[PDB]
């Protein structure tokens, strides 16, 4: 990410509540890599 | 992200929340790599 | 994104709350990659 | 329904196929009877 | 139903294939009763 | 149902095939009762 030399206080909040059903992908977060279905 | 050399107080908030069916994809923060469906 | 070299208090907010059914794609936020259907 | 005397050969066919989400009522045949939401 | 004296061949078909998410009722045939929900 | 004095050949089919999450009522033939949630 945000490589620099100092990162200070960082909050991620990533979430999925109410799924009825999922036949695909649900992702939170992405930075390489493959996902089929 | 924002390299740069210094990053103060970041907050990330990403969600789903009633989602009845899904046969795609639902992705939060995307920087690289292949989602398929 | 805003490189720079500091960034102060930075809030983001994604989200979907009522899908009844999804066959594409739901996408916070995109910087790269491929993402097909 | 058609009391009669007689009935020969009677089909019926009810469906609800590919349904998202659902907080109502879906009914195929109603008579009689109460349904609420 | 068709009350009569005779009734011959009589064929019925109800079904729910692909639902998602279901918060209220799903009736195939209704002929009295209550159903809350 | 059609109550009558002779009933021939009857053939019922109800079924549910595909269902995510359920949190009310699937319910096949109602004739009475009382069905909460």
């Given at each position: 990410h945000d490589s620099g030399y100092e990162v200070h206080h960082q909050k991620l909040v990533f979430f999925a509540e109410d799924?009825?059903?999922?036949?695909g992908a649900i992702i939170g977060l992405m930075v390489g890599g493959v996902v089929i279905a």
């Open positions: 799924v009825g059903s999922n036949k």
